Design a protein around this ligand. Structure first.
Ligand SMILES: *[C@@H]1O[C@H](CO)[C@@H](O[C@@H]2O[C@H](CO)[C@@H](O)[C@H](O)[C@H]2NC(C)=O)[C@H](O)[C@H]1NC(C)=O
Ligand SMILES: *[C@@H]1O[C@H](CO)[C@@H](O[C@@H]2O[C@H](CO)[C@@H](O)[C@H](O)[C@H]2NC(C)=O)[C@H](O)[C@H]1NC(C)=O
Ligand SMILES: *[C@@H]1O[C@H](CO)[C@@H](O[C@@H]2O[C@H](CO)[C@@H](O)[C@H](O)[C@H]2NC(C)=O)[C@H](O)[C@H]1NC(C)=O
Ligand SMILES: *[C@@H]1O[C@H](CO)[C@@H](O[C@@H]2O[C@H](CO)[C@@H](O)[C@H](O)[C@H]2NC(C)=O)[C@H](O)[C@H]1NC(C)=O
Ligand SMILES: *[C@@H]1O[C@H](CO)[C@@H](O[C@@H]2O[C@H](CO)[C@@H](O)[C@H](O)[C@H]2NC(C)=O)[C@H](O)[C@H]1NC(C)=O
Ligand SMILES: *[C@@H]1O[C@H](CO)[C@@H](O[C@@H]2O[C@H](CO)[C@@H](O)[C@H](O)[C@H]2NC(C)=O)[C@H](O)[C@H]1NC(C)=O
Ligand SMILES: *[C@@H]1O[C@H](CO)[C@@H](O[C@@H]2O[C@H](CO)[C@@H](O)[C@H](O)[C@H]2NC(C)=O)[C@H](O)[C@H]1NC(C)=O
Ligand SMILES: *[C@@H]1O[C@H](CO)[C@@H](O)[C@H](O)[C@H]1NC(C)=O
Ligand SMILES: *[C@@H]1O[C@H](CO)[C@@H](O)[C@H](O)[C@H]1NC(C)=O
Ligand SMILES: *[C@@H]1O[C@H](CO)[C@@H](O)[C@H](O)[C@H]1NC(C)=O
Lengths: 167, 236, 49, 49
């Protein structure tokens, strides 16, 4: 007997009840996934369509077939991905890393040393300190590069080594 | 228009040789100039593939279907267990504009046939669950692979321009993935549909078994050659 | 060097002390275009119940 | 003209490469666990489990 004047208790209320069922068949409805923007040339961790991993992303030139999503070179390591929105091939490179070593002339003589990062390009060192050198063995901080050549004192690598005069 | 025509017209159930046909991409991974070994359900090389030229054939656990054809008399396929409304059934049909896939409890006529005067094969349709419409699938050779696993129905397809007279050629071509459908169903038998006008066609059927294969990927990621491990000692 | 060598004096040479690894800056999440919304509009805004 | 003369060096290189390849290949085995990726297990289970 609904009327415009019946107080809150007697008002007509529309009711909708949602029930969720999880039969063994694969799920067909899920909430929005949401996404962010894309960055490049930076060591970040990514979650491309459920494939997660860390590294740095660059633009590549491989030619995927119209149905692949990602590629791996050998030993099952992913190298390339396809972004689900722009549909272009991106290349993944592991973020740089390597050991560090210290060259010293001995505590007996002095206490100034040099630092060598093994297999690391002289682009992301950190900090700065003194003059920095790039060699086939890595990057070196704290020694001066000369043009002469003497007997080898402390073998560094790639046919080069250091001595004490400064280092 | 649920009528019947005949029991047989030619009845040539015969056998022939598969050669090296029935290879499909196992996943969506890109590989360049490599050799990869994978274990999955394949059609063995030099198998014994059945040729017809129309009963309810069994499905087992995967089907390879081939047809050399012109004017595409073959229309679609039907899948299910009891082929009635007491259980879910799958139907795939094609016309000149779109391919249609339905998952419902039909009442198929004992001798399905379409004609034109997209119904007449099912006397009833109810409790429909899944519907899908897309671009049509279809002298020319049509190759399809149907698989069903984990509530997922997978269809791979390929088209080939050929001019060989009688049987499958001595070639090699991989089958690209086409369709995946997320439906839970228990397909065990299947049937073929022909829209032959009011007035019986050659097609080949083979089955799949689990085994290991070796595949060669070229620089562009296309499969160019394959080896069946368990064929002969040289292959091993 | 003194800590790794466990001594208060160090002889002339080269020694390996530790490692170096660049750290990630931020996180990136990408997914296909959102579409095919569920039809809640015609249920809640239905004229007759 | 003739090849296969430098068998020993090629054998050494092949052995080293194969050993490294199988070592890096071993990283994709469950060893009786539920998965092979640490992140999946971390995000799909409570840490004590
Ligand atoms: C996802 O949606 C975006 C937004 O529309 C699409 O980006 C546009 O794509 C068209 C296709 O040619 C371009 O002309 C526009 O310039 C794009 N807009 C931009 C870049 O802001 C994108 O293509 C969609 N992705 C799909 C459908 O896979
Ligand atoms: C360290 O990184 C820099 C920056 O990429 C490298 O310099 C590049 O060298 C290549 C090849 O010579 C050039 O094509 C690029 O134009 C250079 N980039 C810049 C910004 O100069 C440098 O070669 C790297 N170090 C080593 C030892 O390879
Ligand atoms: C081909 O099959 C479709 C299957 O439904 C027929 O139905 C049309 O499908 C299109 C695509 O969604 C719709 O836009 C039309 O409204 C549908 N028609 C009707 C009457 O509902 C289609 O008519 C068939 N075409 C031919 C030429 O046989
Ligand atoms: C009609 O379709 C519905 C929707 O799938 C069926 O209901 C489910 O059927 C499955 C298949 O056996 C069962 O596992 C579920 O328990 C059913 N759920 C419910 C809420 O009924 C239904 O069986 C189909 N047939 C009829 C006659 O309704
Ligand atoms: C597909 O078939 C399997 C077996 O043929 C069905 O599994 C049965 O499921 C019921 C209810 O969950 C159980 O009581 C039986 O014990 C199961 N049988 C076996 C052999 O495991 C399954 O339910 C069927 N699914 C559909 C959708 O028809
Ligand atoms: C693999 O991809 C390459 C790269 O596109 C193809 O090489 C091109 O092929 C076209 C068609 O013949 C030529 O017009 C281009 O000049 C080729 N480019 C180059 C750089 O050679 C190649 O044909 C593809 N297929 C194979 C088997 O390699
Ligand atoms: C029913 O219709 C109303 C009226 O348009 C919807 O409410 C609007 O929702 C949009 C966002 O979708 C807002 O920007 C407007 O400000 C809303 N207007 C009002 C008057 O509330 C409502 O979302 C619809 N219901 C559903 C389920 O879609
Ligand atoms: C360095 O060594 C020499 C002899 O080995 C010694 O005479 C001298 O005192 C040492 N200098 C130091 C320890 O500062
Ligand atoms: C000497 O060293 C400088 C810098 O260390 C270098 O630029 C130069 O090529 C070297 N040789 C000569 C002959 O100057
Ligand atoms: C298929 O099997 C039949 C016997 O059922 C045999 O005669 C025929 O040669 C076989 N074809 C093959 C193995 O290609």
């Amino acid at each position: 007997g609904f009327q415009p004047t019946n107080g809150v208790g007697y008002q007509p209320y529309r009711v909708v009840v949602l029930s969720f069922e999880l039969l063994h068949a694969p799920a067909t409805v899920c909430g929005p996934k949401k996404s962010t923007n894309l960055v490049k040339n930076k060591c970040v961790n990514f979650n491309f369509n459920g494939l997660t991993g860390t590294g740095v992303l660059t633009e590549s030139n491989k030619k995927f077939l119209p149905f692949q999503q990602f590629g791996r070179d050998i030993a099952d390591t992913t190298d390339a991905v396809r972004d689900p929105q722009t549909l272009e091939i991106l290349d993944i490179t592991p973020c740089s890393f390597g050991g560090v070593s210290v060259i010293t002339p001995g505590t007996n003589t002095s206490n100034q040393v040099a630092v060598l990062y093994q297999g690391v390009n002289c682009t992301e060192v950190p900090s700065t300190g003194s003059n920095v050198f790039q060699t086939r063995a890595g990057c070196l901080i704290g020694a001066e590069h000369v043009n002469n050549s003497y007997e080898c004192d402390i073998p560094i690598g790639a046919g080069i080594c250091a001595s004490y005069q400064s280092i | 228009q649920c009528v019947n025509l005949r029991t047989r017209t030619q009845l040539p159930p015969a056998y022939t040789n598969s050669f090296t046909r029935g290879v499909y991409y196992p996943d969506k991974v890109f590989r360049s100039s490599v050799l990869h070994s994978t274990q999955d359900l394949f059609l063995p090389f030099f198998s014994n593939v059945t040729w017809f030229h129309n009963p309810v054939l069994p499905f087992n656990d995967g089907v390879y279907f081939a047809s050399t054809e012109k004017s595409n008399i073959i229309r679609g396929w039907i899948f299910g267990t009891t082929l009635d409304s007491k259980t879910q059934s799958l139907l795939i049909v094609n016309n000149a504009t779109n391919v249609v896939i339905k998952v419902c409890e039909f009442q198929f006529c004992n001798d399905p046939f379409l004609d034109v005067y997209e119904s007449g094969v099912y006397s009833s349709a109810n409790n429909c669950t899944f519907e899908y419409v897309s671009q049509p699938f279809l002298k020319n050779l049509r190759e399809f692979v149907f698989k069903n696993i984990d509530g997922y129905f997978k269809i791979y397809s390929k088209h080939t321009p050929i001019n060989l007279v009688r049987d499958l050629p001595q070639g090699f071509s991989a089958l690209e993935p086409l369709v995946d459908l997320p439906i839970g169903i228990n397909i065990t038998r299947f049937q073929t549909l022909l829209a032959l006008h009011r007035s019986a066609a050659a097609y080949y059927v083979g089955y799949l078994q689990p085994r290991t294969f070796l595949l060669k990927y070229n620089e562009n990621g296309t499969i160019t050659d394959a080896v069946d491990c368990a064929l002969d000692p040289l292959s091993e | 060097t003194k800590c790794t060598l466990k001594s208060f004096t160090v002889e002339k040479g080269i020694y390996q002390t530790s490692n170096f690894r660049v750290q990630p800056t931020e996180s990136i999440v990408r997914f296909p275009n959102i579409t095919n919304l569920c039809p809640f509009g015609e249920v809640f805004n239905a004229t007759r119940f | 003209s003739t090849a296969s003369a430098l068998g020993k060096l090629q054998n050494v290189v092949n052995q080293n490469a194969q050993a490294l390849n199988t070592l890096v290949k071993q990283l994709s085995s469950n060893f009786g666990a539920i998965s092979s990726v640490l992140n999946d297990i971390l995000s799909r289970l409570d840490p004590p489990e």
